[PDB]
Amino acid sequence: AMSDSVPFLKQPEALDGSMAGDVGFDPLGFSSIGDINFLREAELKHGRIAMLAAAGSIAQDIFTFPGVSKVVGTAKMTGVHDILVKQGAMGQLLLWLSFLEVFGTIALLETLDGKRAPGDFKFDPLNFSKNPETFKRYQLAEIKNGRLAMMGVGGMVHGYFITGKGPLELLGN
């Protein structure tokens, strides 16, 4: 059996297709080393943080919060990070995300025992998973947008590094 994404390569042994977005793409064999549930937690966490980062880059190009423009001046995107270490935003956010990630550490400890689905924090306040097909469709869309947001954040930040303009300042000219 050959992999669907890479037809000239053998299908990975640890990829079953039961997970969302599994087309059998693992040429370097990383799934043989790590637990697949741990790897899927890594992928989902990276993708969700990248989705929030991409949306934040687009919005912070679109508009700024009241008062932020005096603190940061004209040093948008990652240039504010250092500046906000001088202010108290970065430390507060790091503390609260560290709290949330201690509870995520407990959740990962429960994932590794076979008693928790990967990426499952059971956070659905507005009920959307009302049907088991809509659930699969949202899982595939979530994992695809997470990967797309990883590469989109890479593009926005490295283009900001080259130009100093931003993702949407570049498209203005």
Partner 1 sequence: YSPVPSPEGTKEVYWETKAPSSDVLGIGAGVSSGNFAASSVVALMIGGFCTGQVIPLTSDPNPLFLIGSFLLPYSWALHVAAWIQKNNGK
Partner 2 sequence: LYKDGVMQGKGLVAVPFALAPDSLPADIPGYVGFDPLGLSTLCNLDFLREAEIKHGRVAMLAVTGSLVQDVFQFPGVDKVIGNAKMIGAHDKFIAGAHAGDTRSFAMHQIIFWVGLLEVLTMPALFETMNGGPRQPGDFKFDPLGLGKGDKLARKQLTEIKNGRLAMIGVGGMVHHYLLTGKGPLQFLA
Ligand X SMILES: CCCCCCCCCCCCCCCCCC(=O)OC[C@H](CO[C@@H]1O[C@H](CO[C@H]2O[C@H](CO)[C@H](O)[C@H](O)[C@H]2O)[C@H](O)[C@H](O)[C@H]1O)OC(=O)CCCCCCCCCCCCCCCCC
Ligand Y SMILES: CC1=C(C#C/C(C)=C/C=C/C(C)=C/C=C/C=C(C)/C=C/C=C(C)/C=C/C2=C(C)CCCC2(C)C)C(C)(C)C[C@H](O)C1
Question: In the stretch 52-91, what mask flags binding to ligand Y with x, by CB under 6 A?
Answer: --------------------------x--xx---------
Q: Residue 137 Cβ, how far from ligand CLA at the closest point, in Å?
A: 8
Q: Does 172 bind ligand CLA (CB under 6 A)?
A: no
Q: Does 112 bind ligand X (CB under 6 A)?
A: yes
CA dihedral (40, 46, 51, 52) positive or negative:
positive
Q: Does 157 bind ligand Y (CB under 6 A)?
A: yes
The HSE-up count of residue 103 (CA atoms within 13 Å, CB side) is 7
Distance CA 118, CA 37 (A): 6
Q: Which is nearer to ligand X, 72 or 108 (CB)?
A: 108
Question: Which pair of structure tokens corresponds to residue 89?
Answer: 């935003």
- Using CB under 6 A, count the residues that bind ligand Y: 7
Q: How far is CA 138 from the centre of its chain?
A: 15
Helices (H), 34-166: 36-62, 68-72, 79-86, 89-111, 132-163
- Using CB under 8 A, count the residues that bind partner 1: 7
Q: Residue 19 Cβ, how far from ligand CLA at the closest point, in Å?
A: 12
Torsion of CA 128, 114, 110, 148, to 10 degrees: -50
Q: Which is nearer to partner 1, 121 or 161 (CB)?
A: 161
Partners of 10 in beta bridges = 2
The residue ranges that bind partner 2 (CB under 8 A) are 6-10, 27-29, 162
The residue ranges that bind ligand X (CB under 6 A) are 33-35, 38, 108-109, 112
